[PDB]
Structure formats: C-alpha cells, structure tokens
Amino acid sequence: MQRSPLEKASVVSKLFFSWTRPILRKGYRQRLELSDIYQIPSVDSADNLSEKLEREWDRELASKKNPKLINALRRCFFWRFMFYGIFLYLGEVTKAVQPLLLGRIIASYDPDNKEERSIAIYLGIGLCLLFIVRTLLLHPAIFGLHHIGMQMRIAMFSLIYKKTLKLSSRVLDKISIGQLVSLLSNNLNKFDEGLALAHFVWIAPLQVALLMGLIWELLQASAFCGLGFLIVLALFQAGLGRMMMKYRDQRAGKISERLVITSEMIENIQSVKAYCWEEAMEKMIENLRQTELKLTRKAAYVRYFNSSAFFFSGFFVVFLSVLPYALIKGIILRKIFTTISFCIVLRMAVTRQFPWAVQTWYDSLGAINKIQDFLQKQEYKTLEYNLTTTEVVMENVTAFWEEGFGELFGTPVLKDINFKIERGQLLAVAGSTGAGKTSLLMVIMGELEPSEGKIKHSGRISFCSQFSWIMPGTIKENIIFGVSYDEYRYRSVIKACQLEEDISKFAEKDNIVLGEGGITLSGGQRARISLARAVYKDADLYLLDSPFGYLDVLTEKEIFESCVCKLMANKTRILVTSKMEHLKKADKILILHEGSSYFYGTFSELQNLWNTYLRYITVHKSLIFVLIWCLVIFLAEVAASLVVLWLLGNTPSYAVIITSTSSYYVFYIYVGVADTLLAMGFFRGLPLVHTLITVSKILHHKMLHSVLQAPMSTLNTLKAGGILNRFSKDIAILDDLLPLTIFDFIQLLLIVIGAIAVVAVLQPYIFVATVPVIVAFIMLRAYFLQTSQQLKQLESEGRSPIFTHLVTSLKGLWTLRAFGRQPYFETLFHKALNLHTANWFLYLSTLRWFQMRIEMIFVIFFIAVTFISILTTGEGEGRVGIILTLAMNIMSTLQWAVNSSIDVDSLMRSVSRVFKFIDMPTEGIWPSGGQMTVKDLTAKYTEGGNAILENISFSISPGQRVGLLGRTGSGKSTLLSAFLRLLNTEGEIQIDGVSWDSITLQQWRKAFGVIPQKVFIFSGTFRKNLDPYEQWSDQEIWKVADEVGLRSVIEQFPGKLDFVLVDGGCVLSHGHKQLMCLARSVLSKAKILLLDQPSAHLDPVTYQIIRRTLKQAFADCTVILCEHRIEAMLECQQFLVIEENKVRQYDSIQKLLNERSLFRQAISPSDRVKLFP
C-alpha cells in the first residue's frame, strides 16, 4: 500500500479536500485497480484506539463502584466533540440572519421603496461574505464529526472481540452467532454518521430563540400563534418516536433467530440436497419472515408521518401567525414574504433537526448500553497452578452440566473420579456411548468446573477433539498454528501422521488454500490434520479424544505405532480409545460406566479380574399502479395552482394591501408555499411505503429460492461471511432504509418540477435562467458517480472478512484457549478491521468533496446574479433582478434533491448485489426391485480437473448387500455422491431399466435413503429434527425411537420430544447424532440405501443396534454400506474396493483379503478368528 495523501498536505488543501483529486480524476476514465487504495492514517489503526479505550475502561472498572462506558468515551472524545460542535453552531447561525440581507435586497426592486435602494451595494457585499463563510464552517466541521464516529466504532469493536475470546463455557449457550452478527451489523455504517446530528439537541433551541426574536419584530404579539402550533406538532412527533421504538424491540430477536437457521443450512447444503429438504427449509424461513414483515410495516407507517410532518407544517404556521395581525391591521406583501422566509428556517429547526437528534441519542445510548452489558458478562476462570512435576492428579471430582443442579448440591455427569499418572505414562479411557469420556477431558482442560474435588497438573497442554476444526488458510498454517516454522520437526510430524500419500496427490501440494470448515477434504484427512497440529506443539500433557474414528485399520495401526508410541514416548498423554489392542500397551486404564469408574488400574489386573431501477420497479405490478396514481394527482394539483395564479393577475380595502409596482411578490409568495400545495398526503404516502416493502419480501423469497438450488461447484466458491453479509445487511437495508429515502426523493423532485412548470408557463424567462445551473448540477453528479459507485462496491465487499473471522473464531474457541493463541487471532481481526476502514474512509472523503463542490457552484452562481440584479436596477422597476433572484429560490431546493439522489444511488448497490444471487445457474411402481447398472461412470468435482473416478462399470441385484471399501481419501464418499449426481459426472446409471436422462432430478433423488458422513442438526425440536414435513404422528416416531435406542436419551430432557436443541446439538454425545441419522433413514421407507460409515465412533456394544436395524428394518432393500470396521463386512454379499482411482469387485471377502498381506496383517485377533475360523 502506498501512503495516505493526508499525511503530507496543506491547510488550504485540507480545507477543500483537494487531496482526493488524484483518485477522482482516474476512476472516471478506467476501473480502480488494487494499487490505488491508500494506507489508513496511523491515528485510525485498530491497535492504538483499542489500547487507549481499553486503558480508560479498565481504570473505570477498577476505581468506581458503578462503572459506565459513557464515562470512558467521554475521557477520550469529548473535547474534540465540543470543538467541532461550536463551528457547526456558528455555521448554523448564518442561515438565520440571511433574510435580514436578502429581504432588503429584494425590496429594492420596488421604486416606491427609496430607503433601501441607497444601501443595496453594501447589502450585496455582506451577503457574498456570509455565503463565503458559511461553506467553510459547515463542511469541515461535519467531516471532523464523521471522523470521530469511525474511531469510536473501531475502538468498541475491538473490546467486543477481546471479551468474546474470554466468555465462560456456561454462557456460550445463551449467545448465538446471530446475536453478535446483528450487534455488529446494525451499527456498522450508521453509528459513524450519527455524530453529525447529536449537537442539534442544544443548537436548535438557540435557533428557535433567535428566530422568534426576529419574527417578533414583524408580527408583534402574533408570532406565538405560529409558535404554539409547532410546539403541539413537536409533542406529536415525540409520541410518534416513542411508539416507533416499541416495534423494533419486538423484532430484533426474530431476526436473530432467522439468521442462525439461514446460516445452518447453507453450510450443510449437501445434506439438505440429498435429503430433498428445500421445501421445508424455505417454509420455515417464510414463517419466520411473516411476523417480522408485519412489525416492519407497522414501524414504516409511523415513520411516514414523522417524515411528512415537515411539508404540511408550512401553510398552517404562516397563515395562523399572520391572520390575527392582518385582521386587526392591514398587511403588505413584503411582511408576508419575510414571514415566510423566516418560517422556512423555523420549521426546519423544529420539525427536522431536533427529533432526528433525539432519536440519534436514543439509538447510540441503546447500542452502548448493550455493549457494556456484554462486556460485564461471566468470564472463563483460568485460576490454577502453572508449575509442578507434571504428575497429573485428580481426586473426588463430580460435575454437573446444568448450573442449577450443581448449585443446589439433575444427575451428575461425573461421580467420584480419581487417578494419577507420572511423567511419560499413557492412560487409556474407555466406556460405552454417553459414558462421559469427552466431559472428563473438559474437566481437565478447565472448561467444566467441578463442584467438588481437585485436579492438579502443570498447565501446558495440547488438545485433539472428537470433531475436527479447520481454520481458513493453507495446510501449513493449520499445522504450525501461529509459531515459528521448524523444518525438521514439520517433516517428522508430516511423515508420522501418514499425510505424505495424500499431500503428494494435490496440485499446489502443500499450499492448498482451505476454506473455513475444510469441506474441500475428506473426513480422515481433516482428522489427520487435526492430529498433526496437536503433535506439532510442545507441551507436558497431550489429550487425544478419539482420533482414530475415520481411519481404516492399516492407517490407524501405522499412526498409533509410529506417532504415539515412538515419536512422543517421553511425554504424558491421555488417549480416549475403544479397541482392545490399544489397552495392551497403556500404563493405566480407566473405564467409565454412565458416570462412575467401573475399573481403574493396569491391564495385568483387568485380566485377573441502468436496468437496476427498471428491474426494481417491475418486480411488483402494484408499484406501477401506485406511481401512476401519484402522478395523476400531482398533475391535477399543478393544473389547479396554475388557474388560481392566472386568475389573480386578471382580476382587481381588503386586509392585504397590493399595488402595481409590488405585485411581483405573488410569485415569490407562491414558491415559498408550494411545499404544502404539492405535498403527499396519506392517500399517496401510505400505499407507496406498503408496496415498496412488499418488493423486499418478493426479492428475499427469490434470493433464498435461487441459492438453495445452485450446483455444488458454484456453492463451494462462496464463503460463510459473504453469505451472512448479504443475508443480513443488504436485506436490512432493503427493508428499512430504501422506502423512506425513495419517498423523500420523489417528494422533493415533484416539488421542484411543479415550481418550475407553474412559473415557466406564466413567465417564459425563469426557466431560461434556471437551465445553466441545472446543467452544471447534472454534469457534476455524473462526473462523481463514476468513482462513487466503485468505492461503494469495494466498501460493501469489505465487510465479509469480519464476519468470516467471527464465525471461525466462535467455532474453535476451545482449541484456541487450550493452545493459548488469543493474541494471534486478535492480530488477525485487527487486519480485517483496517481493511474495511481504508475503503470506508476513502468513500467518506470523496462524498464530502462532492458536497462542498456542489455548495460552491451554488454560491458562485448566486454571487454572480446578485451584483447584476443590483446594478441593472435603474431609476425604477428593476425587471432584470426580479427573474434571476426567483430562479435562485428554486435552485435552493434542487440542491437538496441532488443529495437525495446521491444517497438513493448509494442504496441501490444492495439491490444490485441481491440481484446477482438470483442469477445463479441451476443444477437441473418404478422402484420395484432395486436392480442397478452403472456404465462408464466418470466423476470429477471441478470442470477441467483431475477425475477422482474414471470408467467404472458394475452391476448389482435386488435385495443384496454390497460392501464398499478402500483407503482414506480414495473416493468412497465421491462414489456415493455420484449416485445422486451431486457433482460433475459422465456415463450412465439405470435402476430397473430407467436411466438418468429419462426422468427429472428430484424424482431420481427419491429412490434413495441416505446416511451421510456429516450429521446435520438444526435449531428446533426433536420431532421437527426427525421430520420437517410432519408426515408421521408421534405413534410411529416413538415406535422408531424405541428401536434405534433413543428412548432413554430423549426422556432425559424436560420436554419429551418437545425439547428445543440449540448450538447444533451440543446437548448430545457423538453417538446420539449417529442414532438420529439412523432414525431419519428408517423413517423414510426406501428401496436403495446408501450408508456412509454409520457406526463411526460407536463402541462394540452399540454397533449391535446398527446391525439389528440392517437385519430387521431393511429386509427387501438394496443396501450399499461404506464401512471402515472389519466386522460389518460379515453381512455383505458383494464387495467393491477403490484404489488407484478405479473400482475392483469381488464376491467373497477371503479372496479380497488373501491378496493384501499388509492389510490382512492389520486385523485384530477377535476380528481375525471370525474371518478365518
């Protein structure tokens, strides 16, 4: 990155934002290359702000009894806040004395006003000076206030993450990914810009006090008639704001709930596709959206009135304030016009700048209070010893997973556990499923605090878990995991873990960029990477929680005999295992039985025992009808105003005194009141908001439908953070910020067009005067948008790394805290923060450049017309000055319409991003016997890549068992997915004579019942997790839970089959999820069954359930079983072996095993006697 141009600049350059020119002149011609983003200023780096706010917050916590976050931000930003507020106020007081000069200038066009024609040439100079000094005080102050919100947000987002890395394990079940994502997302671009409105809590009352004193000179005691109406309207607006904030509190939790459901299934898209579960997931998402949209509609109906208050307040204020004075005393047109000029500023101060400031304070303090409440949660306790002889000792330990039951003393997870091991000894833990072997490791690690007992060790540990975690990056980064790279140790760890066979088959071959999750790999490869990472680290104690689950017999034997028994034989290690062979060469054995130690000792003792607006409008056919309605009313209003004006000049005492040389005020008065005459009442503003909110519902439905049916090659290129970004932030934009911004843009545009047309009909010169300013405005807008759109696209793309890092850091909390790598991930998070900050700051600077340039154009044009008007006014009736000055009263509203157009264009980027996902590509009795025939099948994952499987041909027969097998990483899962055409494939398969291309895909996928390798469990009840379609009553559901063995597990929770599972089934063990998958497969009665390693981690006792199910529930079913364990191959009639990317088939298993001496040598004696009796 090249340096920031704001580091070396000039004062005269910092005042006008000239340093932003070099990029603006370039992004206009070509695209914006990478080499053109500047490095952030050193003051805007996450480290400095993070440490500064952290020091202040820690001092606040330590000293005071009642700590508060606002007291800590006050000691960092208050003096700059108050420094910029004063210049903002000085800029705002200019707008109120402007009439005191412009009115005298305008009144000199009447030859019967001789007093003010003397001093015109000095009023003009004063007006030019006032316009010059407003534009220099307003915009730099606003930019300085914008630059402080970014710093505050960056400083608080670091504290949130640093606290997240310390939460207790008993609090993680109350905070989801959705809550943190919502917290970050709703404050990511609005908290920055909210500081430019906070000072109007005290700026606006002063303006009211000044303006009422100025008006009091015109209408002596009648001004309070107009003031009281504004006070009542402000009471009404306060009530509207209070009632608006109620509908948003009821809606946040529903969005939080929807986000986790949306994120769960997209990261499990393959299981959803295999189950054919799209129609149920979409229905759940729709039911969630149904109520949230109702709350959003109710909030928008109130925000409409809040925004509409400003336009309808003009006529009433002016008429009400002028009527009594005019009734007790006649009035001149000059007084009326001056009153309009003052009331225009008064209404802006009262109805648009105060309530927005109040709502800004409400929202900001609401965010800060939630941030503080998060920072005051319960922390993980690390208080333990840090040095000893590393003699692991544990005594009298009992722990409860439920906090209440452990506080009262709910059944104990552990009961009276005690053991001791020396330096270098190996303890083997064994037991049934659900016995509590992983929870013992959690007790040792400190994740589960025991109620009674002690654990004593040093504090240096290495960890390997039952579910493997893969962080984004390459393999080498996943293994070295934040430390120095030692070549020899890396080589020996790679060789010991049997990874060189699979690594040599990769293309980049060591630097494969893995995604967040590792779905580019297989099960055993991820398991071996997770084991190698633990082996690499140096520590006194090594905990290994069933690493051999997904490995075959030969690979497991090699790893155990050359990585645990020869590489780290001089280190203390605790291994959770099941095989009777591993217990032979352990030093101490612990066996658990539902909580209690059934046996502790040795083995010698056990044997003794742009087409985007156009596409957006045409999404819904009712929007066009509403727009045509809004146009037909507007044209009638214009035609009525035209005839009421035309009937004044053609007709001839009364209260209002009007003459011939001062009748030109009739237009000046009209232009100031047309805001009320062309405003949108509730017959036009409520239908518009309603029909614009319906478009978001339609677009969300289309987006979700189109994502769920894309091919897997398209879906793998996506990331978790990008999906989460697009489904949270852009959708919230489309539901909240688009309707009312569009409404304001349309309102202002109609006002400008009506004001121009009505007058240009009666005087065909004011249009001619206005043209050259309109052309300049349009040219500058078109010049700026070319770069603005690119910068906005980059900023919108820059929010994905933050969410990706948040997700990956929440999924791997235990490994991070066990290894001690928190500073590493804090450094990783700071980089993503800086990367977003650069683009956001650049866009924010160029916007202010545009704003000040448009202001300068307006000011120079007005200065040009002022002197011409003053000079050309001869000895009476300054006709030249009557036209240009009125043109400049319509250009002032066009200036506001331009900025409204700018922010509408900035909000359409979300619409374009949403439309990009809708345009993804699309992947698109009979089952009597189940006979299958495969011919010339060839499978490959990516187009133009190596073929995992090449020219496979075999046949099966109805009602026959087939055993599929091979080495780890051979293509068993690839074959079982090529049956369902989940990837790119050629050749054919026919089932009972019916081929692929004869039928549709969704019908071909209903001939199969599948058990996958990765268990998918979403948030919901047990019953819903068993059937989302709700096809079976509780009779059959309980009858099947009786058979798969889930009665005692399900009855353990308070709502029997009504209990709600959170965090993806964290309440269950590893075997209970396998049993739920088996139940799912049993419930749907199919003919052809594809079982991908069903009994992964099950002990020998619980595999009996699987084999009884395969014996009784599947009788007339063609089964294909991909099993790594040797005993399951005793029921199969055919065998398929995958090797060298091709399949060889066998009838008997003896023929299979006699030809593989090494593989045949790896079989345990218990499983050896049965194969060869």
Ligand SMILES: Cc1ccc(NC(=O)C2(c3ccc4c(c3)OC(F)(F)O4)CC2)nc1-c1cccc(C(=O)O)c1
């Ligand atoms: C007495 C007082 C003085 C200054 C401030 N603010 C600030 O210094 C800053 C700030 C913070 C939040 C904001 C904001 C500006 O503008 C916003 F975007 F609108 O939100 C510059 C940091 N705050 C208070 C205050 C308010 C409310 C309660 C308490 C309390 O002590 O209980 C104290």
Ligand SMILES: Nc1ncnc2c1ncn2[C@@H]1O[C@H](COP(=O)(O)OP(=O)(O)OP(=O)(O)O)[C@@H](O)[C@H]1O
């Ligand atoms: N967060 C939790 N809340 C409540 N109960 C839990 C929680 N985690 C686990 N349990 C329960 O505690 C028991 C022990 O679970 P654990 O996973 O340690 O068994 P296990 O011996 O590891 O079985 P497996 O070898 O099949 O994983 C289980 O019966 C489980 O239902």
Ligand SMILES: Nc1ncnc2c1ncn2[C@@H]1O[C@H](COP(=O)(O)OP(=O)(O)OP(=O)(O)O)[C@@H](O)[C@H]1O
């Ligand atoms: N999504 C993917 N994209 C690219 N390559 C993949 C993808 N999934 C798997 N592979 C590669 O294709 C090969 C086949 O993997 P497969 O899952 O069939 O192995 P496996 O036989 O199931 O091994 P295990 O028994 O460990 O599960 C592997 O070497 C793997 O690296």
Ligand SMILES: CC(C)CCC[C@@H](C)[C@H]1CC[C@H]2[C@@H]3CC=C4C[C@@H](O)CC[C@]4(C)[C@H]3CC[C@]12C
């Ligand atoms: C800095 C802010 C608060 C402005 C100060 C507010 C008060 C004190 C000021 C603002 C405008 C002032 C008024 C402006 C004009 C006149 C007309 C004159 O014939 C009598 C005094 C009177 C009525 C002034 C009284 C004081 C006044 C009301």
Ligand SMILES: CC(C)CCC[C@@H](C)[C@H]1CC[C@H]2[C@@H]3CC=C4C[C@@H](O)CC[C@]4(C)[C@H]3CC[C@]12C
């Ligand atoms: C009515 C118009 C003119 C606005 C002027 C009144 C303003 C200042 C009033 C109206 C409602 C008021 C709020 C009503 C309730 C509470 C809750 C209390 O725990 C703190 C004060 C607080 C937050 C008040 C602050 C002041 C407040 C916002």
Ligand SMILES: CC(C)CCC[C@@H](C)[C@H]1CC[C@H]2[C@@H]3CC=C4C[C@@H](O)CC[C@]4(C)[C@H]3CC[C@]12C
């Ligand atoms: C002179 C008069 C008109 C000034 C009025 C100042 C008002 C608008 C200010 C002063 C104190 C402020 C409040 C301070 C505390 C809270 C509690 C928080 O949960 C919501 C914001 C809220 C409710 C603020 C809203 C704005 C507030 C009420």
Ligand SMILES: CCCCCCCCCCCC
């Ligand atoms: C909203 C507060 C208004 C304060 C200014 C009133 C001015 C009254 C002047 C009386 C002169 C006799």
Ligand SMILES: CCCCCCCCCC
């Ligand atoms: C055939 C497309 C019609 C588009 C007209 C929409 C109304 C435009 C004026 C706001």
Ligand SMILES: CCCCCCCCCC
């Ligand atoms: C190009 C704009 C000309 C405006 C001057 C109007 C002439 C008025 C003649 C009485």
Ligand SMILES: [Mg+2]
């Ligand atoms: Mg376990």
Ligand SMILES: [Mg+2]
């Ligand atoms: Mg597999």
